[PDB]
Ligand binder design. Structure first.
Ligand SMILES: CS(=O)(=O)N1CCCc2ccccc21
Length: 284
């Protein structure tokens, strides 16, 4: 069923809470035993948000390989994403170790460091060119190269150096700075413009490791970003774009990380973004 008609029928019937609970009931339940080990308590922001064992990213070290991060591998769309929590004071070195080891070209940040008067993630990148950051626990150096501040987002060029080998790489930081503290954006226009800037950069392409995507827990806004991107790519690839079923794509992605899309308002927003983004790409 054309999702735009499904959309108007859910709106007219006011049945967004019922549709969202049906997704919650059908979602996969896989073990997360490594996340719950006592040694990993200060590596988790939220007790109820953990990576599954089967899809978790492993750090390349014998001491403790754990990070709160999941590989979302979308087979038909030929896209992969790493979804992760906002870094904690004791996991900023792990975060950049993961970017290095997975060969990522982009980091997508969908939160502010402070929201609702509380810290939602560590200040994990440098704010001034002449004040670089050294992560002694993972042997990395990170330097701010340039910053472009726009009304709805900021793009940063960063240099990450592996101090062990003196190899360097350019990382692109895409920071969506205007998601409201409560609810979802009224229009998906700035969020779609942002998604198109990340695509334009090469950060989502198969010549690179997977993009790293985060918010505070790495499931709500982060889930909206990957769900919208995958649904639009399938609408381009298939003979019948009207066959793309957003609820079935979301349940496929929930095989790889729990809790993607946190509210009925985030579900409605993801439908709006896909419907509006389909028109704009259609030369329309
Ligand atoms: C009353 S509702 O269940 O249909 N609902 C649930 C929460 C999200 C939403 C957004 C716009 C309009 C209705 C809703």
């Amino acid at each position: 069923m054309e999702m735009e008609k499904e959309f108007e029928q859910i709106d007219k019937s006011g049945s967004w809470a019922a549709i969202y609970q049906d997704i919650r009931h059908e979602a996969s339940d896989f073990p997360s035993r490594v996340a719950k080990l006592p040694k990993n308590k200060n590596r988790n922001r939220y007790r109820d948000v953990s990576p599954f064992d089967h899809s978790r990213i492993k750090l390349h070290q014998e001491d403790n390989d754990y990070i709160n991060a999941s590989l979302i591998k979308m087979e038909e769309a030929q896209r992969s994403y790493i979804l992760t929590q906002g870094p904690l004071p004791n996991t900023v070195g792990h975060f950049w170790e993961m970017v290095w080891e997975q060969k990522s070209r982009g980091v997508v940040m969908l939160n502010r460091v402070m929201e609702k008067g509380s810290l939602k993630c560590a200040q994990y990148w440098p704010q001034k060119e002449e004040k670089e950051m050294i992560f002694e626990d993972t042997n990395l150096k990170l330097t701010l190269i340039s910053e472009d501040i726009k009304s709805y987002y900021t793009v940063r060029q960063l240099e990450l150096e592996n101090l062990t080998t003196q190899e360097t790489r350019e990382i692109l930081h895409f920071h969506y700075t205007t998601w409201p503290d409560f609810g979802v954006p009224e229009s998906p226009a700035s969020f779609l413009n942002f998604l198109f800037k990340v695509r334009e950069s090469g950060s989502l392409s198969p010549e690179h490791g997977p993009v790293v995507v985060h918010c505070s827990a790495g499931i709500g806004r982060s889930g909206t970003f990957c769900l919208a991107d995958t649904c639009l790519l399938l609408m381009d690839k298939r003979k019948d774009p009207s066959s793309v079923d957003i609820k079935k794509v979301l349940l496929e992605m929930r095989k790889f990380r729990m809790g993607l899309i946190q509210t009925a308002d985030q579900l409605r927003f993801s439908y709006l973004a896909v419907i509006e983004g389909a028109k704009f790409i259609m030369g329309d």
